[PDB]
């Protein structure tokens, strides 16, 4: 089927190569997963040496890290808003690595409440002493404050759904967030 | 055609010829898994209810469940499916199988009784066929006899007697999954081994930590002065 051998390519001089051998199993490729959103559906593919892989088809939730606070939360994915490789992936909401998505902002809001208690967006001393000690770190970033106000958070996918079967990622921050804001998510 | 009919509650079987093909038409355009009434099938099956279990057409091709056609087709058959026994690991073969829908081309129709009729038959319901052999697993015998849970199964294992002409001797199946002191010994051996390996590892780690503490103190207190 799909083959990864370099034999079929032209030579670096531009010459056509003569057929050397039949396609080998140890050089095969497989078709893309094309991971969609919603109604989780994983398929397992058996690979070389056993070592099964997980094809993520139409999954809806993933684990996303907030690298500034050192926490990762399980949160569902709203949609794909940017892909640096192909705009068709954005149009079809295909979930791949490096894809820019919006997720939920809700588990992160609730953790922020429980950890700092700053009623972000619009009891006993046991928690109050902890909140006072964790103060001076309550302020984070205006650009993510506004996304919390909007109710969804910009994230970048860092896992490979077609390989591991999971769509995990991290919240966009700092220069990366400002860059992706300029690129397509803003300026229409 | 022929009707291979089986009465399963006693495991009895017989084959019935039905000529005058204007009467097997009750089966026509039916499929495996559909009940049929026996009065139309014949005057002997008054009230008897048959259901289609299978069949074989002329040329002997078996009928496949799910193939909703009155004709036979070729199919790529795989392991653990009907009409094909693989001869190798992962071998799949293309074979012709008859469709599931009953038609005039069938030579034998395999039927099973689901409801008893009004009369009795010469070889189906008047007799019985005993089961080949009884339960072998411990809880299978315990369920079969249904006495209790705290009961010996050695005495309730079913025994069969075989005569060699001069001496008759009984034999019974070897009970599986039976709890035994040997199994208990194996289990406690594995348990003790896991525990013992845990202490061995902890002791080795403690000794290594002692060695590192000794070297860390000595090799650095000796070089502090220099």
């Amino acid at each position: 089927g799909i083959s990864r051998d370099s034999r079929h390519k032209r030579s670096a001089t531009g010459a056509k190569r003569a057929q050397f051998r039949k396609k080998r199993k140890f050089e095969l490729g497989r078709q893309p997963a094309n991971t969609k959103i919603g109604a989780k559906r994983i398929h397992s593919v058996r690979t070389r040496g056993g070592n099964k892989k997980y094809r993520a088809l139409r999954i809806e939730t993933g684990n996303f890290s907030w690298a500034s606070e050192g926490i990762s939360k399980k949160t569902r994915i709203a949609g794909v808003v940017y892909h640096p490789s192909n705009n068709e992936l954005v149009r079809t909401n295909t979930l791949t690595k490096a894809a820019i998505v919006q997720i939920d902002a809700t588990p992160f809001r609730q953790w922020f409440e429980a950890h700092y208690g700053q009623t972000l967006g619009k009891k006993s001393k046991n928690a109050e002493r902890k909140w006072a000690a964790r103060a001076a770190s309550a302020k984070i970033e205006s650009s993510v404050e506004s996304q919390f106000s909007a109710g969804r958070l910009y994230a970048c996918i860092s896992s490979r759904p077609g390989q591991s079967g999971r769509c995990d990622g991290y919240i966009l921050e700092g220069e990366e967030l400002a860059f992706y804001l300029r690129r397509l998510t803003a300026k229409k | 055609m022929k009707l291979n009919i089986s009465y399963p509650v006693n495991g009895s079987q017989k084959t019935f010829e039905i000529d005058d093909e204007h009467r097997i038409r009750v089966f026509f355009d039916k499929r495996i898994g559909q009940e049929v009434d026996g009065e139309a099938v014949g005057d002997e099956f008054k009230g008897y209810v048959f259901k289609i279990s299978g069949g074989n057409d002329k040329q002997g091709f078996p009928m496949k469940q799910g193939v909703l056609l009155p004709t036979r087709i070729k199919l790529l058959l795989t392991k653990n499916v009907s009409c094909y026994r693989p001869r190798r690991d992962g071998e799949r073969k293309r074979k012709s199988v008859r469709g599931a829908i009953v038609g005039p081309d069938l030579a034998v129709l395999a039927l099973v009784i689901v409801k008893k009729g009004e009369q009795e038959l010469e070889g189906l319901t008047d007799t019985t066929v005993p089961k080949r052999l009884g339960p072998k697993r411990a809880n299978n015998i315990r369920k079969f006899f249904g006495l209790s849970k705290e009961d010996d199964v050695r005495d309730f294992v079913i025994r069969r007697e075989v005569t060699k002409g001069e001496k008759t001797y009984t034999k019974a199946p070897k009970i599986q999954r039976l709890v035994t002191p040997q199994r208990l010994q194996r289990k406690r051996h594995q348990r003790a081994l896991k525990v013992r390996n845990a202490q061995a590892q902890r002791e080795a780690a403690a000794e290594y930590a002692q060695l590192l503490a000794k070297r860390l103190s000595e090799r650095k207190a000796e070089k502090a002065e220099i």
């Binding site: - | 080795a204 780690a205 000794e207 290594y208 060695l211 590192l212 070297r215």
Partner: protein
């Protein structure tokens, strides 16, 4: 092609096995084990070809299946088990023990040892790594892993294994003026003392070795096996002590012996 090979054609077997060209199309292919098949001695080769305790592989199998032979304290009924350098072979009958060491002509020589020496063995440190749960370990030349080693044990050192429990009882660092044994190349079987070594960052550290009677040679670091200090080796040397006399003076010794 399509998978691992299971046959070893004769004339493709290692030359140091000293197999007769005729009398067979095939040679005993060593099974997977502690040693590479190029520098290993199968049990059938040691028992039939070297010791003449068997006439053929059928009698070799008859010997092994009686639990008579044991390698490094374990029975090892495998006919083609890859016993290699420094290994200890024990025969329950005949009350003898053997240690597999090359003679100076680069082949395993039948070398008998005592029970005290058969109780232990040496190993060359191939790597020192931190295992799971932060536990350090070392890997010897015979594919053996020993957890919790001495912190000063570095790569290509020598460790002494108790051979009844896989534990290190002593170790020798790799340093100038230590008796080494050559285990590869054209210098198989030589025993000498390290003069110095050449660094050569980028691969193939080079070691200069001086023989007992002042024959200087150089060898790759991969073929160097420390076995003790200047004098007093940790292992009983085979007959010859690895000196590599020239062919003229081997002739002279042979004639002196034969003609009295």
């Amino acid at each position: 092609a399509r998978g691992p090979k299971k046959h070893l054609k004769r004339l493709a077997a290692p030359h140091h096995w000293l197999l007769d060209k005729l009398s067979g199309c095939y040679a005993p292919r060593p099974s997977a084990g502690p040693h590479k098949l190029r520098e290993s001695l199968p049990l059938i080769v040691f028992l039939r070809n070297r010791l003449k305790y068997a006439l053929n592989g059928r009698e070799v199998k008859a010997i092994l299946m009686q639990r008579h032979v044991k390698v490094d304290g374990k029975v090892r009924t495998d006919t083609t088990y890859p016993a290699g350098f420094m290994d200890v072979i024990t025969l329950d009958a005949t009350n003898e023990n053997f240690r597999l060491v090359y003679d100076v002509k680069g082949r395993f020589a039948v070398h008998r040892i005592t029970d005290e020496e058969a109780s232990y063995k040496l190993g060359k440190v191939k790597k020192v790594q931190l295992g799971k749960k932060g536990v350090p370990y070392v890997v010897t030349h015979d594919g053996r892993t020993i957890r919790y080693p001495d912190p000063n044990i570095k790569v290509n050192d020598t460790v002494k294994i108790d051979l009844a429990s896989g534990k290190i009882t002593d170790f020798i660092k790799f340093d100038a003026g230590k008796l080494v044994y050559v285990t590869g190349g054209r210098n198989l079987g030589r025993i000498g003392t390290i003069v110095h070594k050449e660094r050569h960052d980028g691969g193939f550290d080079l070691v200069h070795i001086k023989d007992s009677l002042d024959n200087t040679f150089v060898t790759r670091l991969n073929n160097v096996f420390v076995i003790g200090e200047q004098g007093k080796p940790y292992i009983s040397l085979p007959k010859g002590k690895g000196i590599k006399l020239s062919i003229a003076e081997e002739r002279d010794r042979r004639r002196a012996q034969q003609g009295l």
